[PDB]
Amino acid sequence: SIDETRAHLLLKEKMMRLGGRLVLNTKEELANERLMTLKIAEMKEAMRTLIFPPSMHFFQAKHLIERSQVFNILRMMPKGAALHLHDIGIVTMDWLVRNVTYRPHCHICFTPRGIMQFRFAHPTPRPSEKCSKWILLEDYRKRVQNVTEFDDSLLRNFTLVTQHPEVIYTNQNVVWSKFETIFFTISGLIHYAPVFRDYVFRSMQEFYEDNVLYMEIRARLLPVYELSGEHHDEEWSVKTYQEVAQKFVETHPEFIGIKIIYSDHRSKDVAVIAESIRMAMGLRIKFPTVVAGFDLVGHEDTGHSLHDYKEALMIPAKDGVKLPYFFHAGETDWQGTSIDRNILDALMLNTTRIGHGFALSKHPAVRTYSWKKDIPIEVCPISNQVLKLVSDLRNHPVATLMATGHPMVISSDDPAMFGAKGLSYDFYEVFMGIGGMKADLRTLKQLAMNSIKYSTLLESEKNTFMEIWKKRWDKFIADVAT
Amino acid sequence: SIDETRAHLLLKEKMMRLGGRLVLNTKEELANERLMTLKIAEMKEAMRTLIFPPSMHFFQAKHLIERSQVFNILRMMPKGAALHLHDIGIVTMDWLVRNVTYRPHCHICFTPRGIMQFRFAHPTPRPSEKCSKWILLEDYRKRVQNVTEFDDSLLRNFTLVTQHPEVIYTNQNVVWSKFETIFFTISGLIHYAPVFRDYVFRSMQEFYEDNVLYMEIRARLLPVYELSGEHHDEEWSVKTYQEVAQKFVETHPEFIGIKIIYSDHRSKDVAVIAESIRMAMGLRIKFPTVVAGFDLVGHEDTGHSLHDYKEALMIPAKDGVKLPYFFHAGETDWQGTSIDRNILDALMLNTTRIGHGFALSKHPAVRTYSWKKDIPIEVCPISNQVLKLVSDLRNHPVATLMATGHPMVISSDDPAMFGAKGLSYDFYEVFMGIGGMKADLRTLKQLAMNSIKYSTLLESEKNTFMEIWKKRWDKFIADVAT
Ligand SMILES: OC[C@H]1O[C@@H](n2cnc3c2N=CNC[C@H]3O)[C@H](O)[C@@H]1O
Ligand SMILES: OC[C@H]1O[C@@H](n2cnc3c2N=CNC[C@H]3O)[C@H](O)[C@@H]1O
Ligand SMILES: *[C@@H]1O[C@H](CO)[C@@H](O)[C@H](O)[C@H]1NC(C)=O
Ligand SMILES: *[C@@H]1O[C@H](CO)[C@@H](O)[C@H](O)[C@H]1NC(C)=O
Ligand SMILES: *[C@@H]1O[C@H](CO)[C@@H](O)[C@H](O)[C@H]1NC(C)=O
Ligand SMILES: *[C@@H]1O[C@H](CO)[C@@H](O)[C@H](O)[C@H]1NC(C)=O
Ligand SMILES: *[C@@H]1O[C@H](CO)[C@@H](O)[C@H](O)[C@H]1NC(C)=O
Ligand SMILES: *[C@H]1O[C@H](CO)[C@@H](O)[C@H](O)[C@H]1NC(C)=O
Ligand SMILES: [Zn+2]
Ligand SMILES: [Zn+2]
């Protein structure tokens, strides 16, 4: 009888965790059995040695994750869609250094402060008040003893990856300082028109290679520029995203495409943000098929709150227009402050999705409300660790949310900055670290399907996506089963 | 109307968090207002500088906590009872070195391995297997150049406190290794009969000084010894605890006293543990007023599970006897393993309280069940940090439990080993770190009263305790209000 109470409690928890009610077919049961065997063995060994990758910093754990049979299987998995990504954090930096810096007319410089910076131009730009002298890379590489070392020093400046990140990044402000500095540095490389096209195209290649078929991207839409010095506008960038995605889908008929969530920094004046809201509405009218809506990005702890921006964020409503929102919210360790209430305010503004929602489990009422309105959180485990919200991903607050089957999708955020690629590394962390030992094939399947369900595609486009994904899923099942 | 939805969600969260429905009188409202002003200002500053003690390792944060006006107020607070403590971790080590090592007949030694160890004996005991030569301390202390350097090196071996604990304690096994070695070292000092009495008495002094009025102690009841070499038994230790506590209450009429929870190590054979269960039953019969029940202690990750011990733990039930249990359970970062299911099995064995219950929020069904049976968790924040379950106490899983007003008590576990004293440091961590910015005087008051409610005292003794505590509370309120 007490045995029955015990078994009942275990079955209840089996049922309410994420994906726990999905019915598996006998083929899937077989794949799950082989998957779980590999998982359990790996966890037993980590319990013995205490070498457990999700509990270590991703920089040090990455090489271990790459040796994992579980990771290997997750690489193969059709993961659905990547829903939380940033314009310039989605392509391995290797290609930026080895390919892009070797292209004609690439110039390098250093600010009065010593911050690296790039520009494609002809001829050499005029010394300005942010760059005492510009220097062509082809000249610079001739004057250096070890070229391969100079190149590696560029790669080390383009990511956060380092040994001893605990010593390098002493606090959250230091890490955010370096983070943003990287965006600034690589900016001049990516926003040169023919690199921009190649960049967009390559990010689709990398995610397609990771078995991800759809992408929604938070994009600042900064001006793209030509060798002449001409600057393009927001319209032109959205047109280009559409065009490159069409070109990609033409040679990869299973890839669904990309949509754009227009974004601006939360460190700006409400008046500037009001200007950005109008742009977003204009972009929606002009490109209703490409532009999903709007978001505010940047260091959440130090910038303005959603409340601070109420006047600007209500503009669409006052014009009787619906501008969908996809707010970053509650990406913080603070509890009961103006920052974690951003989740509440995102919900009050009818957000379609919540970015991160890290502080959600500390607010039971908001949690219930979001679950009731079926508004998912976009969880990005590697980002949260690297940006120092949580050391050991076993302690990630989303573990509680998975345990009650909360609506959520997994994404990678800025994989390239963390030394990750695509979506598989983040699926590893969720499946091995956050979900615990009982997270199974159902958890994975549910998370894959969620990413199609909570995308901004039309319902008929969702069906077509489901159709394509189901077939890739069966193929995956059959492989793992043998 | 959306404003109303927003205000409703905030009020709901205000109401369901721990203590949220306690009605404050106007005096308490005034104390709360002055308390919250000091708390908010301190948090504002920590948000500015990122110097926030609960987010730092306690070893480095302690000196900052001691400069805090909030800590100061919490020192003054009548906290009720300390319900989760261990026999030999409750007295500042300063007194062990400065006072106890200076007492006649103290001998020091080093195991083949170099582990320090102590023994009071007259005459000097014969070299045995584990010690090739006992040396009197009074000799040793003359045969050194700097004696207060030698003394400090003893204090440094008696606690875990260190600079750079991240480097010293690389993993959880290393920290547990050092932890247990400390217990082994100081053991010979504390179990000499007249030190034992003095030790017990002093731990009451230190908790009484911290404005704590009752203690329940997990005690191994290891043999206490005399200068002759005679050993006493378990009965004798329980008699002594009772006697010293009576002596203490005689000169401190407001102190309620102590009870003993008998304990044994979870690294032992089920047959040995079966023997220990019978001892506990015997001790309950002999001392129904002193011995509250039984518990299993030690490193939970590496020892046997509660299930492993089923045969032995069911002995009382098979004899038709009720041996109350107070299990340590789910003191782990693992999820879905045999270790965190110990919470489930503690509940199935009718545990009166759960020690730590760290993994509770990852098991929604067990959470609901324990809430329904009104079974509290004993949360020890500093311990969980030092023993490396969690880096930043803002990420403590109990934050979620506080937000829904889960039944819990706060204790300090082994304050002396962490460089803490009494209960105030742990109340600081809960109130500032785990509880978030909206934790107020109601939270504190609820936690104080909970510790009387969930003690093992008789209901009429609880009333008397409440009476005494209420008077100390009013005095505290009047002070803080001015
Ligand atoms: O478009 C690049 C911009 O996106 C922003 N951005 C890039 N990655 C994240 C970002 N914003 C907030 N939180 C962390 C993570 O989700 C960042 O401010 C950068 O300047
Ligand atoms: O009586 C001392 C004994 O209690 C045990 N002990 C002392 N403090 C704790 C302990 N057990 C388990 N977890 C951490 C914390 O609650 C320890 O094994 C030691 O040998
Ligand atoms: C690049 O080098 C500079 C030198 O000023 C350094 O300060 C900066 O942190 C580097 N960027 C990184 C490691 O992302
Ligand atoms: C949210 O939805 C309500 C109810 O339909 C609507 O009146 C309001 O304008 C919306 N708010 C925003 C910011 O879109
Ligand atoms: C040491 O402790 C004992 C008992 O706690 C106390 O009476 C004595 O005064 C102390 N010794 C010294 C030298 O102060
Ligand atoms: C442990 O034991 C010896 C004895 O003094 C000492 O040399 C060593 O430094 C001690 N360890 C610590 C951490 O104090
Ligand atoms: C727990 O309580 C039940 C129901 O009264 C009883 O049958 C069982 O023996 C108890 N278990 C223990 C370990 O005391
Ligand atoms: C690298 O860039 C593109 C990949 O988009 C490739 O087609 C081209 O051949 C390469 N060019 C150079 C200059 O390395
Ligand atoms: Zn993001
Ligand atoms: Zn304990």
**Could you tell me which residues are beta bridge partners of residue A355?**
A328, A378
Structure tokens at B196: 């034992």
d(CA B344, CA A406): 23
Structure tokens at B47: 């948000």
3-state secondary structure of A325: strand
d(CA A481, CA A37): 12
The residue extents of the domains of chain A are 1-482
* Catalytic residue of the set A356, A363, A396, A406: A356
Where does residue A48 rank: exposed (0-12), middle (13-18), buried (19+ CB within 10 A)? exposed
3-state secondary structure of B212: strand
Count CB neighbours of A62 within 10 A. Answer: 17
d(CA A163, CA A165): 6
Q: Are B312 and B273 in contact (CB under 8 A)?
A: yes
3-state secondary structure of A230: coil
Nearest to A199 by CA among A90, A336, A337: A90
Solving technique for this entry?
A: X-ray
Residue B466: partners with Cβ closer than 8 Å, 6 or more residues away: B449, B452
Nearest to B333 by CA among B375, B391, B290: B391
Q: What is the number of H-type helices and E-type strands within chain A?
A: 22, 11
d(CA B252, CA B241): 16
Structure tokens at A249: 């889908």
- The distance of A403 to chain B (nearest Cα, Å) reads 6
Nearest to A384 by CA among A449, A300, A267, A450: A300
d(CA B329, CA B346): 7
3-state secondary structure of B311: helix
**Ligand 1 neighbour A183 (Cβ under 6 A):** yes
Which ligand lies nearest the alpha carbon of B296?
Answer: 2
CA A157 → CA A152, A169, A178, A206, distances in Å? Answer: 9, 14, 9, 21
Largest Cα–Cα distance of chain B, in whole Å? 85
Cis amide prior to B123 (ω within 30 degrees): yes
3-state secondary structure of A355: strand
d(CA A67, CA B119): 51
d(CA A397, CA A184): 31
Cis amide prior to A381 (ω within 30 degrees): no
The distance in angstroms from the start CA to the end CA of chain B is 41
Nearest to B43 by CA among B388, B416, B440: B440
CA-based angle A314:A318:A319, to the nearest 5?
Answer: 120
d(CA B112, CA B141): 22
CA B363 → CA B10, B283, B336, B343, B396, distances in Å? Answer: 26, 35, 9, 9, 15
Nearest to A255 by CA among A227, A289, A220, A215: A215
Nearest to B335 by CA among A64, A445, A403: A403
| DSSP code string of A60-116 | HHHHHHHT-HHHHHHHHS--EEEEEEETTSSS-HHHHHHTGGGSTTEEEEE-TT--E
Nearest to A357 by CA among A332, A383, A321, A338: A332
- In a mutagenesis test of the B interface, which of A166, A362, A372 is the best target, namely the one with the most B β-carbons within 10 Å? A362
Q: How far is the CA of B190 from the centre of ligand 5 (A)?
A: 14
CA-based angle A335:A338:A342, to the nearest 5?
Answer: 90
d(CA A401, CA A326): 20
3-state secondary structure of B162: coil
Q: Which helix (H) or strand (E) holds B275?
A: helix B270-286
Count CB neighbours of B145 within 10 A. Answer: 6
Q: Are B377 and B407 in contact (CB under 8 A)?
A: yes
The DSSP 8-state label assigned to residue A328 in this structure reads: E
CA B135 → CA A348, B96, B186, distances in Å? Answer: 73, 18, 16
Decide which of 3.90.209.20, 3.30.390.10, 3.20.20.140, 2.40.70.10 is the CATH code for B1-482.
Answer: 3.20.20.140
Index of the ligand 6 atom closest to the CA of residue B156: 14
Residue B463: partners with Cβ closer than 8 Å, 6 or more residues away: none
The DSSP 8-state label assigned to residue B72 in this structure reads: H
Count CB neighbours of A44 within 10 A. Answer: 12
Is the C-alpha dihedral spanning B350, B355, B359, B361 positive or negative?
positive
Q: Between β-strands B80-86 and B212-219, what pairing exists: parallel, antiparallel or unpaired?
A: parallel
Residue with the two structure tokens 């990398």: A206
Structure tokens at B106: 């103290």
d(CA A388, CA B279): 49
Instruction: Mark which residues 297-326 of B lie under 8 Å from A by CB.
Output: 301
**Could you tell me which residues are beta bridge partners of residue B258?**
B215
* Active site (annotated) includes residue B331: yes
Instruction: Mark which residues 4-33 of A lie under 8 Å from B by CB.
Output: 5-6, 9-10, 12-13, 16
- Residues just before a chain gap in chain A (C–N exceeding 2.5 Å) are none
Candidates A2, A166, A438; nearest CB to B336: A438
**Ligand 1 neighbour A28 (Cβ under 6 A):** no
Index of the ligand 8 atom closest to the CA of residue A98: 14
Q: Are B315 and B282 in contact (CB under 8 A)?
A: no
**Ligand 4 neighbour A349 (Cβ under 6 A):** yes
Structure tokens at A222: 């900064």
Give the rounded distance of the alpha carbon of B148 from its chain centre: 30
d(CA A134, CA A285): 41
The distance in angstroms from the start CA to the end CA of chain A is 41
Structure tokens at A457: 């595609």
Which residue type occupies A52?
F
- How many A/B residue pairs have CB atoms within 8 Å? 124
Kindly list the strands in the beta sheet with A135-136, ordered across the sheet, starting from the edge strand earlier in the chain: A116-120, A106-110, A135-136
d(CA A436, CA A429): 10
CA A206 → CA A91, A192, A378, A429, distances in Å? Answer: 7, 21, 20, 19
Q: Are A397 and A359 in contact (CB under 8 A)?
A: yes
Give the rounded distance of the alpha carbon of B385 from its chain centre: 13
d(CA B204, CA B255): 9
d(CA B123, CA B482): 59
Q: Between β-strands B377-379 and B408-410, what pairing exists: parallel, antiparallel or unpaired?
A: parallel
Candidates B6, B395, B404; nearest CB to A364: B404
Nearest to B401 by CA among A400, A40, A285, A182: A400
CA A422 → CA A78, A83, A208, A245, distances in Å? Answer: 12, 12, 8, 17
Residue with the two structure tokens 């970062």: B333
Long-range pairs of A452-461 with CB within 8 A, sequence gap ≥ 24 = A452/A80, A452/A81, A452/A214, A454/A83, A454/A352, A454/A353, A454/A376, A454/A407, A454/A409, A455/A81, A455/A83, A455/A214, A455/A216, A456/A216, A456/A259, A456/A292, A456/A293, A456/A324, A456/A352, A457/A214, A457/A256, A457/A259, A461/A256
d(CA B456, CA B200): 20
d(CA A161, CA B303): 37
Gyration radius of chain B over CA positions: 23
CA-based angle A369:A373:A378, to the nearest 5?
Answer: 90
The DSSP 8-state label assigned to residue B340 in this structure reads: T
Q: Are B306 and B349 in contact (CB under 8 A)?
A: yes
Q: Are A5 and B344 in contact (CB under 8 A)?
A: no
Q: Between β-strands B354-356 and B377-379, what pairing exists: parallel, antiparallel or unpaired?
A: parallel
Nearest to B328 by CA among B220, B212, B218: B218
d(CA A50, CA A392): 12
**Ligand 2 neighbour B87 (Cβ under 6 A):** yes
Q: Whose CA is nearest to atom 14 of ligand 8?
A: A99
Instruction: Mark which residues 338-367 of B lie under 8 Å from A by CB.
Output: 344-345, 348, 361-366
d(CA B130, CA A134): 73
Q: Are B373 and B347 in contact (CB under 8 A)?
A: yes
Asked if residue A87 belongs to a known ligand binding site, the reply is yes
- A62 phi/psi in degrees, rounded to 5: -55, -50
d(CA B284, CA B286): 6
Q: A404 vs B301: CB contact, 8 Å cut-off?
A: no
d(CA A249, CA A408): 27
In total, chain B counts a number of residues equal to: 482
